[model samples]
Target: SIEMAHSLAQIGIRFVPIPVETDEEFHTLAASLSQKLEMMVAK
Candidate 1:
């Protein structure tokens, strides 16, 4: 939703679309992104 996206933006978070063909690929990408965002917020 736009509201959730806007909330993330307020926290300096942004999304980049990652093309994937399978659920496993999508989850892997999501996990990596989650870790990166967590590290960023920890700073």
Candidate 2:
């Protein structure tokens, strides 16, 4: 996931990336992104 983000960012592309491997991980990531980015959307 980090690799993908770095690759995209390197190419001048911006996106909200989310990993859904597990329910717990998803929620944790969502909360983290929300706090860090102000606005975040997750599935």
Candidate 3:
């Protein structure tokens, strides 16, 4: 995901990326993302 973000950013592509359903439904990544989302929301 980080690699894809880098490649797209390099091309000046402006967009919001959504995580895969499986990622959020079944992985540690879900907790990581949700925690960051809360922090982002706080700001």
Candidate 4:
């Protein structure tokens, strides 16, 4: 079915613990950070 209740994006978001000064930390937790955002936008 072509329907939806929510959506997501790959753009950088504004959340706590932000001082991202390295790519090492960037791609790592950013995935799961967005996971919280998964809940952040949902429920």
As for TM-score, the candidate ahead, 1 or 2, is 1
For model 1, name the residue pairs that clash.
none
Show the lowest summed lDDT stretch of 10 residues, model 3. 23-32
1 or 4: which has the higher lDDT? 1
Q: Rank the candidates by TM-score, best first.
A: 1, 2, 3, 4
lDDT of 4 by residue, 1-43 (tens): 3111122322444434555678988787677676777786685
Q: Give lDDT for model 2.
A: 0.67
lDDT string for model 3 (1-43, tens) is 5875676578675546666667546366657655765675585
Against the correct fold, how does model 1 do in TM-score? 0.61
C-alpha root-mean-square deviation, candidate 3:
8.2
| Model 4 clashing residue pairs (backbone) | none
Q: Give the worst 10-residue stretch by lDDT in candidate 4.
A: 1-10
What shift in Å separates residue 5 of candidate 3 from its native position after superposition? 0.5
Cα displacement (angstroms), candidate 4, residue 27, comes to: 0.9
Question: In angstroms, what RMSD does candidate 1 have relative to the true structure?
Answer: 2.6
lDDT of each residue in 1-43, candidate 1, tens digit only: 6564576789887776668899999799879877887898795
In model 4, what lDDT does residue 20 have? Answer: 65
Q: Which stretches of candidate 4 lie over 4 Å from their true place?
A: 1-14
